[PDB]
Design a protein around this motif. Structure first.
Motif, PDB file in Angstrom:
ATOM      1  N   UNK A 363       0.968  -1.287  -0.013  1.00 36.25           N
ATOM      2  CA  UNK A 363       0.068   0.024  -0.025  1.00 36.25           C
ATOM      3  C   UNK A 363       0.840   1.245  -0.068  1.00 36.25           C
ATOM      4  N   UNK A 364       1.802   1.444   1.026  1.00 35.41           N
ATOM      5  CA  UNK A 364       2.399   2.612   1.148  1.00 35.41           C
ATOM      6  C   UNK A 364       3.493   2.749  -0.142  1.00 35.41           C
ATOM      7  N   UNK A 365       3.699   1.670  -0.826  1.00 39.84           N
ATOM      8  CA  UNK A 365       4.579   1.506  -1.898  1.00 39.84           C
ATOM      9  C   UNK A 365       4.050   2.199  -3.068  1.00 39.84           C
ATOM     10  N   UNK A 367       1.298   4.102  -2.800  1.00 39.72           N
ATOM     11  CA  UNK A 367       0.957   5.777  -2.414  1.00 39.72           C
ATOM     12  C   UNK A 367       2.373   6.399  -2.872  1.00 39.72           C
ATOM     13  N   UNK A 368       3.457   5.939  -2.543  1.00 40.79           N
ATOM     14  CA  UNK A 368       4.677   6.552  -2.901  1.00 40.79           C
ATOM     15  C   UNK A 368       4.816   6.914  -4.585  1.00 40.79           C
ATOM     16  N   UNK A 369       4.314   6.043  -5.490  1.00 38.60           N
ATOM     17  CA  UNK A 369       4.401   6.358  -6.838  1.00 38.60           C
ATOM     18  C   UNK A 369       3.431   7.180  -7.183  1.00 38.60           C
ATOM     19  N   UNK A 370       2.018   6.890  -6.586  1.00 35.73           N
ATOM     20  CA  UNK A 370       0.838   7.985  -6.883  1.00 35.73           C
ATOM     21  C   UNK A 370       1.450   9.377  -6.534  1.00 35.73           C
ATOM     22  N   UNK A 371       1.753   9.657  -5.274  1.00 36.21           N
ATOM     23  CA  UNK A 371       2.527  10.914  -4.780  1.00 36.21           C
ATOM     24  C   UNK A 371       3.419  11.391  -5.779  1.00 36.21           C
TER      25      UNK A 371
END
Lengths: 491, 467, 494, 489
Positions: A363-365, A367-371
């Motif tokens: 999830x966090x990884x 989210x990092x790409x999207x951000x």
């Protein structure tokens, strides 16, 4: 001869009873709702006939027959790596591992029966001696011969599937298998169960039946496939449907029944079956993490944020996550062990801990790409907008960066969008927690075992620092697989 | 007067130039891709005519006229809280805060010009005296009078002034960020200072959406076709997009300021402050919704008694309480602006925003994971009511509370909010509902009252024995 | 021979100039603030003489001689595993890896000079041809023969920097003046191994690689206060001694050319010192796996001893401490599997995989230790002292308060003592803080990696994304230190 | 007059039986292992006499008597804010919240008895009517008049009543957790409900610290000798321990309640409410000290303009502001108790604590990391001043702000707070300064009002298209319900 896609598409039109959302599906190969995913399966088959992939996609067996690597049994570490490279090539070629239940994954699981078929017979109960190990093997050999996709249905949410009738011909089963992925696209359904406390014997069923078996209804969620493959180059490629299977007085002849009636048998033999699919999931996870890292490298580069140090470390984070997946996979392969039939199996603890690490952080990884992608992820030009006389020039100048054509920003964002910001992509996100046993599951069933206790290897070093204190021999062959895997890990 | 939903819709048919994906929109009020969200804006006007909502949605002005609460200026705390309660009520009525740029939000921003117009005029460079503070005020008053949606477009080939004369200015370029502009009445142009910006790119003005030369270019619509399967995402997509200005003419009357890079440091942030305070109101309501869905879905499945799930759900509840703590302390520790409006405490509501944007994404994963299979795999309505499938579905969705179909009800909302394109957009939008998480930290830290000479230094210096 | 701890201890009384806090140290072997860690080094040497550990701890070199495994050069993966096996044994035997800079670690790093000595000499600038490659190798043969501890001082914080610089060059040698700001255990070593890392703008007179004894005139070792504890019953790990950290001051220190490995070349200082410290990084990962094993082990023991181990919420916390250790293991084993040969034919583990293994530990260890501390409950903070436990009135209360399903009640104190020393004393806190300086830190691992072309869209990570988006031998290399990094990545990605 | 530090130190020498580690203590006030923390208690009392602080530290009652603000009953929001300013001032004055159980904290909790004495009496079982609410109140009035420190011991071989007669009760067993008891005047005995708790273990009472058959068994003292090298940890160690009760007799006059497991469910929560509010006041100040130390060390080194550093410091600053938001909002949304006291919103300050307990570890780890080598490796004072080393240390420690020696000053405080035994106890104790993260979440979620039929259900249900202490049977249950209603409207 290896099955072609064309033969596959033809075989689908067999009267199978399938719902996709509100609609009834007359032919899974041609219905607008299913036909892109069906074609993905056809392409799977046609990959085995591509001249340039023959080394990787096929093998010559001892009988001299060219066979798809999906049937290939591996008896040592080098053979295991060759199989992994097959699975890896399949998913790399097919939209970057977006289709987690291609038939190579589904059928990997049958390796457990072939390896050690006898306990499935000998531990059966309620049976009157009708089940035979040889017929289990016969079925798997038949599947392999015809390249048949055997979709596994083991998980349950009293609606569970049960034996309602037994005669000299076979059994009748009634009930629901609550979870299934791509079953409407398979040839056969592979029925199994996992132990739960108090599981009734008449629910302990392992067997196979065709997808069009009378009384079988396949009920799937609505299709998330997109119409426009230019705006949606991945989600227009088809939707691997999930759903449930209803069994209304379905008859299964004893020849295709693998085991019934023994709840202790359901404690460890099904884990052994799903081991192969777990190992597959880690290969998939690795490839997805490589894709995610790679997309962060392409988007931060094309935007020009790649040389900002804050961004550098976050991208390095995505790359490190991929390396952790690879380190678990490689180590799992190095520290494998032989199964009783002499297949070589990667180390169960290491590749399951691989999975837990993925399921914990993916999830966090994402989210990092999207951000990192800012606005380029969601708000970009449609094709017609981009090619319009008046808009084109503005769009070129707003998407100009150092590396390459401005339209490559749109190309990148379409993928980031499809994978991570569409229903279709979100399904993948969610499925990951159902591709074999969840995170909480890995940790619970490992921690219940006596070798993770103070008595076990993890207690040894802590004890001294504190100043405290062969399947011939082993009586449970599938319990021994778990103990031998920790042996190898902690030595 | 008080604008109605009907008047609103009618007003959209004004020959504005709008792309939505590949399509050209003949009429935003009736086009299959835009009409549901148009109707949500209509619902918003009609809200102010609902008799049970009149105390909350409207005030009596100094003149004696009933006005929509989006035009009310709060001059102390209790007035501020009346306004928040209005914003909260709007978003609770309209699909659980699923539409972040309803007209009350867009227009909040105009408070800054009214509160202190003069400096916008006096700081203008190169207008040869044509821009008038009082004209800024008359425009907002005009906007107030007719309940006009002024859609803000500030954040950035950018728009520049290409021609000045004695009637007005001519602008040419793009405003790359805009949300819901295809549904608004007027576009509100602004800019934020960036290192080495030219005077010809510093521009604040207002202009109609159908102003000749204006082209609204929006992403494809994510609205869903079937409202039963998708109760929220069928309700309409708040389009994001860009606006192109092809040598567009704006009169001096509707120009607020030009030319001064210095002005674009502070004053635009004072405009967007209102948007950020509104952001936290909304984030609180999203947090509340998420917590409530975790409770509903754990209670329907029956996992709510498992201590591991309790602590996971408590955490969702706590996150909502953290949003509320920030919002309330921001109101409590606010201050009067130059013109004597009461403004919530910038620092606290923005740290509030920081906290949401840092944690929302894991909080959502938590609801999704708690909801298990009930988010992707559940019965469509026809499946559910099929004579063969009904009895299996009922047996699979049975549990302690309620009726088995409620699972599908809860599932559809979770799916729509967090597992659709439509829902995902609201996800991505939070990082662009004003200044992003890294910007909050960076613009705070570049000011010297968070240095060692500031108040954060004082306790540390005493404990350290420093000077 | 192999040196004995007695030999080592005698060697410390050589007049070295050592501050430990406010105090000057007459003799490191016997002073109260140093003597326990000195004895831990004495134990390290003696461990090599223990008959039951001879196959782990020693080998027979080519020339028929039995030496300590710290000098062993590993030329293939199975020899690599034997070296790891030796480092593991040392650290398991020495208080569950609480002494990170034992001589086996310090000297492991000299392998890079032995591997490929010539560039140190040929890339030197300003030495007037006095430096010889042969002499680095000679010093190392001398260190090996006497099992000498060479403590590395490379790390640092324009005409104002206080870092070690060359202030005289002549026919005999160099004279250096200044500071090497970080050093671990230097007061306990035989020789200082001097190095530097490149930093933007570094002048040539601050590029120095050399060796000088710890008692060289002009050398002063300035260490932080000692954190050793007095009572070893209450503190069974932190009574064993404190591996001091500190800086070394050099005032006009003479080093002969024979003991100068390289001067002058800032370009050399960028990758060659990374190649020296690769061995220390690999060892750091081995230690990180053992520390994790200990943390998970302590967590099992305390949850079982308290009886909380069956609470499912607790079980998942311990599983996660267990998965972390397995994460370390996985990186370590993978790095050994996809290793590569250096110019001089050593087998080196895959640089990228073990460094990412360290990043994973450095990013997460803090949370992991917090888990243990939280799971252990009040048993960390408050437990009986020994006399309290044995007091005739209190003993009955303590036994009944410390009962549970496994072992003797007093075992909860035994476990508590270890958790307390490791994670809740000054002594344990330094080790906690040291993990981030035991090799280039988390930030450095990520920045050095990302500056390189092979992590750009042009290298291997670009390739799958580009296809999905529809977009579009050391002889033959010039910089052998660079090519190690390219070979490491090729082996990781294929 | 308000008690003086002198009179307090003199009072410590009453023959109390104290272990500190392996040693017995003749006199807590003078023994090397305890005298520094004892002097910090003496300093607490002396703060109240300082003329520049007595407007903060004291109030005048309607009898004209100047009283320590630790005894001040707050009846509305502004009065609660004055109390909070007082607790704040105290902890800023005493080593930046390094002493979490000063007498103001310990005694705060007595507010609940005073507010509503009568249920303690009426709900008692097995006392033959000997417990009297009027005597509960008289005890608290006494404590107040002599500024006595009543250390609470509640959390659990447990203490059980082994004898009941006409004069009082006899108790036997252990109170496992106690902070500062050896420095107090009285022990405030309590218990929390747990399933199956027998009546003979439900005990609320007060007994002198020197009562016959009481032994205070404390962990070893963590105090440091050199106050130059250790400016905080030299100031004394707030001991933790257990208290053994050997057939200890307590007069009925000093028993507040026995016998009723039902009373133990919520009334103990209501006692501890006040300490929990105080914990969040302390958590804000610790957050403030952590954030400012971050600002000081990054600034003095020069890393403070590196944008990656800036965002990490902004996060520490955010954490402080988060504690302050919960604090302020709790105060804003408070409510009156049955006796007319104004209490901050229980749910909001408990969630504030939760937030702290969940994140403090990472926040402290950030400060330690940001502080670099300056954490561990820095000069001792004699090193710094030595003629040969001085020049080197000055240059190594130069940066843009202040004198080079200031980096050693910042280092010494970061070292004491987070890298010593002493600081580490304060680290571990956070999780014991009130019910821990796990407990806040669990007793919240078993309450019916967090179900789907409570106010969290409302918005969800609508979007999914689904579907006064006189009236109240439980006054202590009512406060919770009122707290949620006030937080959710």
């Amino acid at each position: 001869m290896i099955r072609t896609g064309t033969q596959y598409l033809e075989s689908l039109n067999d009267g199978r009873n399938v719902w996709v959302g509100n609609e009834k599906i007359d032919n899974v190969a041609t219905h607008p709702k299913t036909r892109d995913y069906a074609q993905r399966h056809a392409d799977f088959y046609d990959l085995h006939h591509r001249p340039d992939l023959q080394d990787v996609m096929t093998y010559i067996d001892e009988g001299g027959q060219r066979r798809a690597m999906q049937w290939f049994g591996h008896r040592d570490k080098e053979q295991l790596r060759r199989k992994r490279k097959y699975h890896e090539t399949v998913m790399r070629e097919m939209a970057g591992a977006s289709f987690p239940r291609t038939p190579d994954v589904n059928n990997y699981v049958l390796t457990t029966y072939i390896d050690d078929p006898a306990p499935w017979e000998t531990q059966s109960i309620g049976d009157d001696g009708h089940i035979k190990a040889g017929k289990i093997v016969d079925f798997i050999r038949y599947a392999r011969e015809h390249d048949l996709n055997c979709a596994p249905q083991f998980v349950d949410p009293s609606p569970g599937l049960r034996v309602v009738e037994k005669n000299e011909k076979g059994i009748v089963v009634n009930g629901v298998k609550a979870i299934g992925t791509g079953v409407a696209f398979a040839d056969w359904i592979h029925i199994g169960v996992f132990f739960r406390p108090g599981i009734p014997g008449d629910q302990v069923i392992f067997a196979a039946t065709p997808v069009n078996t009378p009384g079988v209804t396949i009920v799937c969620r609505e299709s998330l496939v997109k119409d426009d493959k230019v705006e949606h180059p991945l989600a227009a490629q088809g939707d691997e449907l999930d759903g449930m299977t209803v069994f209304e007085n379905v008859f299964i002849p004893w020849s295709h029944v693998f085991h019934i009636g023994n709840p202790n048998h359901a404690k460890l033999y099904p884990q052994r079956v799903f081991d192969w699919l777990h190992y597959h999931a880690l290969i998939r996870q690795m490839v997805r993490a490589e894709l995610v890292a790679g997309l962060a490298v392409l988007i931060t580069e094309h935007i020009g944020t790649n040389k900002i140090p804050a961004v550098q470390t976050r991208v390095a984070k995505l790359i490190g996550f991929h390396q952790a997946m690879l380190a678990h996979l490689i180590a799992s392969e190095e520290l494998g062990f032989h199964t009783p039939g002499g297949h070589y199996k990667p180390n169960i603890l290491i590749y399951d801990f691989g999975r837990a690490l993925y399921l914990e952080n993916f999830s966090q990884m994402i989210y990092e790409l999207v951000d990192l992608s800012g606005r380029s992820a969601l708000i970009f030009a449609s094709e017609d907008q981009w090619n319009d006389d008046k808009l084109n020039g503005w769009f070129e100048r707003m998407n100009n960066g150092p590396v390459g054509r401005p339209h490559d920003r749109v190309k990148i964002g379409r993928v980031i969008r499809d994978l991570f910001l569409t229903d279709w992509g979100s399904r993948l996100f969610v499925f990951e927690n159902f591709n074999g046993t969840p995170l909480q599951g890995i940790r619970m069933l490992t921690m219940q075992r006596a070798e993770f206790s103070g008595s076990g290897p993890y207690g040894k070093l802590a004890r001294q620092v504190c100043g405290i204190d062969d399947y011939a021999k082993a009586l449970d062959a599938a319990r021994h697989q778990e103990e031998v895997a920790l042996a190898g890990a902690m030595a």
